[PDB]
Design a protein around this ligand. Structure first.
Ligand SMILES: [Mg+2]
Ligand SMILES: [Mg+2]
Ligand SMILES: [Mg+2]
Ligand SMILES: [Mg+2]
Length: 755
């Protein structure tokens, strides 16, 4: 580029910066092409072009001005890239602001979507504010290749589409530009199918939607509604390995954590809306907005000390009672809680408070509701036509055709969308087995094998691997979490190693072992010591997340206290011993709302949590217990640096079944950070109980779940214990401990104590 052209850009004299900024083809070779990417990045000292899908990164050079950058790259196609921009000591990674010069679908857009590889398809499908022929308006576009006709109906035309009939391009996608309408426009698509039947559909790629049970889509100027402040969070994320950090997740269903009064408006970020009543049977109650949740949930979580909030599915869904797991509006956060910019604010405020956001994401199926994806264009478009692979009959839902390019594209681009537009830090997928198996919940003779005679759903495995490959290339540093309940191998291993590419898997066998164990009267736990220890046998085959989820405190399973045997004191004590054990056992941590304060009743998705319980001491003490346990977890490296390495854990003794005692070490990089953990899973106290330790010195009683401030009896070692030179459990030194009833101790060597 010339200095004249550079200065035109710098001084805002250029007639159209898209002529020179962005990606431009320079020349075509035999087997490749030469491209330049240009950027004007005021205040940046350095930049790079990342091609994350090729695992390449190229520096940009300043050309004529220190803040004008060019990068020449040779490659056959340059469809997928990011700019890394350094401004002083800080780096950000963004999409190129000059990537798309028009709002309409190009030929290239259509080709990439036809192949399934358009990672930013949602910039062109759906509804977008833009300019065509010199006039501002909205561009609509929708994939409906077998439709006979499609029209845009909406507020702007009184729901009559005759003068807003769309144009079909390339026998596949319908489009329309509508001048002078903008964000807030309410619309649907009116489709006629090959039989001549006329019906109405929400926008598959819609960004916002009326409040259930109304289904119209709503136009959102998604890049001009919210100003983020989370660059430093995002930078630290990208540059960090979350597997080596503390990850303590507070699992939340947004609709049932806390309700407000329906006698007042729902406040929004600078605005308000009418209240959303929770149900016709509880009409005095309304949902809190994303804005109110940012003001209330976030400081709650921060004070409790969790590192992450995991949300049950927030994608648009028509029925409260599905919990979010039957989604019909994949590209929009539910309007129960307000607007897209209110959820953006929630995520930005989490990041400001150093809390990450993990979304449950639901790619496995979709319900049959007529407004949604089903039989979309008058054929089986999103779902597979064969019900043996296309329907989950026991659930009444439909299964995406994962092998179909444009369907795979809808879902792969949708995962990316949430990280792009909403800055989230991770996803979790429930019931991954529902995708992986062609015989899932199907009787003999009602499914068919794959092309090699097996039960593996090949197309779904390929889709899952593609999602995880892409997500980690575009957004290193995220969490991708699976629940898979059939012992499918290598769930949380890289794709290149034959994995599914997740980085964490819920340890469902651990959850079953623990909750079954603690439900046993303590005298009988001696017959089930194996429940305590078994999950370490297979532990190193995956990277495990220890999750006690919403699914475990519904349907007659009781909340945590109600699972435990004994009198009220003992029920509490069992809860503290389980969770102390959970937080010291190798693996990351997840627990669900209400567990932290000892709610007695099961989770009820139709009301809010029983917050009045926190007026009472035993609930306050249990909440303090979790506040202190989360603090300890973040403070002690040996509870999180080596979760997934043999070094991080070793049993000391786990043979004393008769007294349901077990003990173990956790380690980190510094040997002085090693912790001794001792568990007593009966109410029998022990005045003298010997445990082997690896070094001489004073072992501070760093944590004791029987402390009085947690509701315990206050038994323990009065600060700590000097080790004896008395060999025990195959170690040279040993502690003669007092073991409190139904309690866990954590001890730590203080190599500076005065003898
Ligand atoms: Mg009509
Ligand atoms: Mg399940
Ligand atoms: Mg058993
Ligand atoms: Mg209530």
């Amino acid at each position: 580029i010339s200095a004249d052209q550079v200065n035109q850009i710098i001084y805002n004299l250029h007639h159209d910066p898209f002529e020179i900024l962005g990606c431009h083809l320079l020349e075509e070779g035999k087997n490749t092409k030469k491209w330049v990417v240009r950027a004007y990045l005021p205040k940046a000292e350095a930049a790079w072009v990342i091609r994350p899908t090729e695992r390449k990164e190229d520096p940009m050079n300043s050309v004529h001005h220190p803040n004008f950058f060019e990068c020449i790259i040779e490659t056959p196609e340059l469809n997928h890239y990011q700019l890394k921009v350094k401004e002083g000591e800080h780096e950000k990674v963004i999409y190129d602001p000059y990537a798309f010069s028009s709002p309409y679908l190009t030929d290239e857009d259509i080709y990439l979507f036809s192949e399934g590889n358009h990672h930013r398809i949602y910039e062109k499908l759906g509804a977008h504010v833009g300019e065509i022929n010199g006039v501002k308006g909205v561009y609509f576009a929708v994939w409906a290749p077998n439709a006979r006709n499609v029209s845009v109906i909406g507020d702007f035309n009184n729901w009559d589409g005759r003068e807003h009939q769309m144009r079909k391009r390339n026998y596949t996608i319908w489009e329309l530009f509508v001048p002078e309408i903008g964000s807030g426009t309410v619309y649907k698509y009116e489709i006629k199918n090959s039989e001549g039947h006329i019906y109405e559909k929400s926008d598959p790629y819609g960004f916002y939607r009326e409040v259930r049970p109304n289904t119209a889509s709503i136009v959102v100027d998604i890049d001009n509604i919210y100003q983020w402040h989370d660059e430093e969070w995002l930078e630290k994320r990208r540059n960090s390995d979350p597997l080596k950090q503390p990850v303590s997740v507070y699992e939340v269903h947004l609709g049932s954590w806390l309700h407000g009064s329906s006698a007042e408006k729902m406040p929004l970020l600078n605005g308000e809306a009418d209240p959303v009543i929770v149900s016709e049977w509880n009409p005095g109650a309304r949902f809190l907005s994303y804005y109110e949740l940012a003001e209330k949930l976030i400081p709650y979580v921060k004070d409790m000390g969790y590192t992450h909030i995991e949300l049950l599915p927030i994608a648009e869904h028509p029925f409260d009672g599905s919990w979010g797991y039957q989604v019909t509006g994949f590209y929009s956060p539910t309007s129960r809680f307000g607007r897209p910019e209110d959820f953006m604010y929630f995520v930005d405020k989490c990041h400001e408070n150093g809390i990450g956001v993990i979304l449950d994401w639901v790619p496995g199926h979709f319900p049959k509701d007529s407004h949604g994806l089903a039989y979309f264009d008058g054929t089986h478009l999103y779902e597979h036509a064969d019900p043996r692979i296309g329907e989950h009959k026991e659930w009444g839902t439909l299964v995406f055709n994962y092998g179909r390019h444009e369907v795979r594209n809808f879902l792969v681009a949708n995962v990316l969308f949430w990280f792009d537009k909403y800055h989230v830090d991770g996803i979790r997928v429930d019931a991954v087995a529902s995708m992986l198996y062609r015989n899932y919940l199907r009787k003999e003779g009602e499914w068919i094998a794959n092309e090699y005679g097996g039960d593996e759903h090949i197309e779904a495995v390929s889709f899952i691997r593609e999602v995880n490959t892409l997500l980690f290339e575009y957004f290193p540093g995220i969490l991708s979490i699976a629940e898979e309940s059939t012992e499918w191998e290598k769930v949380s291993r890289p794709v290149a190693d034959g994995g599914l590419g997740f980085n964490l898997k819920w340890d469902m066998g651990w959850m079953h072992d623990m909750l079954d164990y603690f439900n046993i009267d303590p005298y009988f736990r001696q017959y089930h010591q194996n429940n305590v220890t078994f999950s370490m046998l297979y532990y190193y085959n995956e990277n495990f997340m220890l999750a006690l989820s919403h699914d475990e405190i519904v349907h007659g399973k009781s909340n945590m206290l109600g699972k435990m045997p004994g009198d009220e004191w003992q029920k509490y004590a069992n809860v503290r011993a389980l969770f102390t054990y959970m937080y010291t056992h190798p693996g990351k941590k997840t627990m669900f709302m209400s567990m932290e304060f000892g709610q007695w009743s099961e989770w009820n998705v139709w009301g809010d949590l029983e917050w009045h319980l926190l007026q009472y001491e035993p609930h306050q003490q249990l909440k303090q217990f979790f506040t202190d346990l989360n603090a300890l977890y973040q403070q002690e490296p040996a509870l999180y640096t080596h979760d997934f390495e043999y070094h991080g854990f070793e049993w000391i003794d786990c043979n004393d079944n008769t007294h349901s005692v077990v003990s173990f070490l956790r380690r980190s990089d510094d040997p002085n950070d090693s912790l001794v953990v001792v568990c007593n899973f009966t109410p029998q106290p022990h005045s003298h109980y010997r445990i082997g330790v690896p070094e001489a010195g004073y072992y501070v009683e760093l944590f004791n779940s029987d402390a009085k401030q947690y509701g315990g009896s206050n038994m323990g070692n009065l600060g700590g214990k000097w080790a004896d030179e008395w060999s025990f459990h195959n170690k040279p030194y040993s502690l003669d401990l007092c073991l409190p009833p139904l309690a866990v101790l954590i001890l730590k060597l203080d190599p500076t104590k005065v003898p």
